[PDB]
């Protein structure tokens, strides 16, 4: 069981972290956490940094990388294929808070730091 206090704690820890690279934060919720699901990235961040992002990008957690399809189309960036599997293989669940930062690499790499509830 996840308590309300744990949720508040994890969100506060995530909010304290301020990467030097461009970043956004997202609290994982159930509609993002099942096989075949999608997840839209924040629209402002997507417009500023992810125009022309296409195809399988690298999502990195603890120096391991997962392929996640990220398509920017009709004004929104959407994760699809590979996103759920990234969360499952990293034992991420609802309430965990992920900070995604855009690394200074040739291709698109989003590095995740997870602030886990339990
Ligand atoms: Cl919440
Ligand atoms: Cl694509």
From Swiss-Prot:
DNA-binding region: 24-118
Annotated TM spans: none
Annotated compartments: Nucleus
Free-text disruption phenotype from the record: Reduced vernalization response.
Top-level taxon of origin: Eukaryota
Tissue expression notes: Expressed in roots and at lower levels in aerial parts.
Segment forming the signal sequence: none
Function: Essential protein. Involved in the regulation of vernalization. Acts as a transcriptional repressor of FLC, a major target of the vernalization pathway. Binds DNA in vitro in a non-sequence-specific manner.
Miscellaneous field: Lethal when expressed constitutively.
Identification of the protein by name: B3 domain-containing transcription factor VRN1
Gene behind this protein: VRN1
Parent-record interval covered: 221 to 338 of 341
């Amino acid at each position: 069981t996840v308590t309300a206090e744990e949720r508040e704690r994890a969100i506060n820890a995530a909010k304290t972290f301020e990467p030097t690279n461009p970043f956004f934060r997202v609290v994982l919720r159930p509609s993002y956490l099942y096989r075949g699901c999608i997840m839209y990235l924040p629209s402002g961040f997507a417009e500023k940094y992810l125009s022309g992002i296409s195809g399988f990008i690298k999502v990195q957690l603890a120096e391991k990388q997962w392929p996640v399809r990220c398509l920017y189309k009709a004004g929104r960036a959407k994760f699809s294929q590979g996103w759920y599997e990234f969360t499952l293989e990293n034992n991420l669940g609802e309430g965990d808070v992920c900070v995604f930062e855009l690394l200074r690499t040739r291709d698109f790499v989003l590095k995740v730091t997870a602030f886990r509830v339990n």
